[PDB]
């Protein structure tokens, strides 16, 4: 028996967070191929959101690994389809990505507070080390892109920022 | 308009195959991390079904890209959760994968037959080029794994084939 | 006698397609040197359409080679002058290139359907392998350029896309 | 079970084409060592037809492999002895090979036609990918050798082509 | 004076954990040379448990270093002799080590809990950074070895795992 | 305005020479693939007249570029099909090419005489620099090929000079 | 808005710590150039406290960056001048630095306790990661320098430790 100091509601929250990072993986994939659509056509954003979808999928597998290491049982649910089919302008899509990563951050903070309430020192530091500082950086990066996309405006600017920054 | 000789029924099956390949990616991920579970503990299979999950995910993006190249529209649906939570013995899982890649093959074949009936020569060759011959080889490999897993038996055999073959 | 399973109307269609790809070679050359004209002056487009004229000329020689390999007889006709003398804005010229490559695609699809009706398995796969997927990619690429040229607008944008993309 | 969309008359055709490609291997061997005979003594042809024998033997193994991938059963038959013991002039032997690869081509086309009649999309592409275009090129090459061997005539010319071309 | 926010019961706990990590070092040494004994003769395990002994001895020195950095006083005690003289089957010994690192884990958690109760933020992170996550991975690894050693069974299997895995 | 000392009659002859060089490119292409025809089968000449077609096409773009550099306007006309469909013997074709490059020379000479009569010093040197001395060498080479093709005779000779000289 | 789980009192302490670390940078600079003064003349310490000034300045920018990453607002205040103009003996200065890094530690600890009380898990780990364990090591090093400076005495000793240790 490897399980030690690993609460059962902790275990249930990791199962949830796994679903959330998969849901995020699938939302970014939806964005990536929206900018590959011929009537949108921003290759840099295609690149940028494909990698994002790769990363939160890593997130999920890092949480899957942690579940096994602590001695719990992975339990999967349906990954729900993304909230939209099309994503508007390049600025609109980065605003949704900001809203999405803030939603993920809040869950990671709730999981941390949960783990903390049950005295799980290791699960706290694991979440601090793999997710919390990286979320903070993800959020600040998106925040800067939104300021920039507003600064360059529409038309020529949207093209330029796609190519020269997101790619 | 880039759309040419691309039938709306073909477009809908593509979306249907995007969901299917994503479904297979999510099943393999389930298996991969079942073999990482401490009570199962087969690192070779864990490695083997993790790559398999990557492949059918690559399959989905290859279809997403093709939907865009032909001037269609991606429409995503939920990714249903895997049929099982645990996957039994190493031989039991390889059988489970054989049944899945056959299901996907029949689906890819029906999608070919649909495309052919609408006169879509390029779609036919594209499915032939990227999917039909790969499925044949994938099924043949699963079959040989099943035969070899039966030859090596349970216990020491299952270990050996895990490390030496799938690893 | 090398001729085997090679229909006489097939042979007549290859002779036609040779003329069409030459006509396309000559249209792109007309575009390439229109952007080299001092009152137009977009060097990137000059590059971009010179290479296009090189490529459909390869197309012709690939069809000439196939004619000989199958045992037919190449028969040449006049290459007709391009439909226009000047080609308008950079966006206007890429729209004509989209119309031209769709016209070529349709002929390649008609030749395929023709070859198919006469049971010519090899000529079908030859057309699938050298022309059909490449046409699909050519069309999607042009489609994206047209979206982008509309996005960046006129003046500064037209210059920027010429230099940073087409060159 | 791995067999899927693999019809029993297709499987019987595959067994017939393994025998024919082995039969062709054995004719080419016969010729290659005819030219090694001291009353003939054409070292270039020996080397050329030895290689062609390796070639159609690789064909046979390629088909045996395909039979196993689809879940068929290889069933072998006697390989009949070549039609002749000696092969006349070098030009006579190249004409014998042209006739032979045309027979193989027709047989390969009939196998495709049967595969297509049962809706075996994958079998059709496999034959297209590995055999149909390679047969066209081999036939054209033999055709060009026959024209060239007529051009150089007999005596000194036959010597020259053997050494400078077939070697 | 360098001591700062370093409480006396924390300092006493550090002295207790130096003894325990030295005790663990000395158990692993006992096992490693049990497997070197000619009636046992498992060279992989000898090498694996020798290294684990070096390991928990590095742990001890890491803690002695920490005691000095905070301005504590190292106070050493006898290292008790391991609980057994011989360690049964290889699987028996891996079970003995699992039990041992769990004891160390619980002790390490209690030390964290005490450090946190006195508000020693730095002591908590130090234990998180150097010990807590490493203990989880060691426990999971021992757990996986125990499942695998059951899988290969006794006799030939025990031989194989010793050489191919622990070595 | 960049146009200086560039007479309108000179401008029109340039367009007339663009057509002529394109006409020569299309003739050589016709010859090149006549020698690739299985009943003719002279790979050396095929290679030789393919390069020749590339050269006079380079000639046309060199004239197109010069029309633009002097501030004129390209006006394209049809490219007439080659005078013959087949080209007889290897010697017969080299004679056909000699007659063509002489025609092109007289045309280039008349274009020089026209430019000189209008006082266009730069155009004169440009034609001298890029065309007059190249035509002299091209004609001299064709002449030597004709003399050598007559020396080597028909049959074996024609083969030999094809492979060893034009190849 | 990027601001999430970032309390306004935490924001104000960050600004307060930016000032403190800048204050320490300006103190070390004062010391560094006291040891460069001709009547003091200890190049090793000059080098040692110049680097120390660089470090706590790096500390301030690391806090400035963190204020921005969390969506707060930098507010700068005066940097007060160092407590002394001269710094006495080499041992006297190292004691002065030990008192300063302890002051900064208590400040960093209170900032941690403040962040923890407002539930800011990421801020806590960030301070742990970048500051708490570095301060422990910095204080331990100053302590050892003080002990060594007392062992080597005044005069020749002070020289020796300056060049051989701080240099």
Residue numbers in the entry:
A (entry chain A), B (entry chain H), C (entry chain A), D (entry chain B), E (entry chain B), F (entry chain H), ...: 3 to 169
Sentences from the paper on this structure:
Ferritin is the main iron storage protein in most living organisms, playing a key role in iron homeostasis and detoxification. Canonical ferritin is composed of 24 subunits, which self-assemble into a quasi-spherical nanocage with an outer diameter of ~12 nm and an interior diameter of ~8 nm. Ferritin has prominent octahedral 4-3-2 symmetry, and each ferritin molecule contains 24 C3–C4 interfaces, 12 C2 interfaces, 8 C3 interfaces, and 6 C4 interfaces, which provide several potential pathways for metal ions and small organic molecules to diffuse into its inner cavity. Thereafter, we introduced a self-assembling strategy by designing π–π stacking interactions at the shared protein interfaces involved in two different kinds of 3D protein nanocage superlattices, which is referred to as key protein interface redesign (KPIR).
As a further example of the general use of our design strategy, another AfFer mutant named P156FAfFer, where Pro156 was mutated into Phe156, was produced, which can also assemble into both BCT and SC superlattices. As a proof-of-concept study, we introduced His/Phe at the C4 interface of AfFer and created 3D protein nanocage arrays with two different lattice arrangements, including SC and BCT. As expected, crystallographic analysis revealed that the designed residue sites are involved in interactions between the proteins in the two 3D lattices.
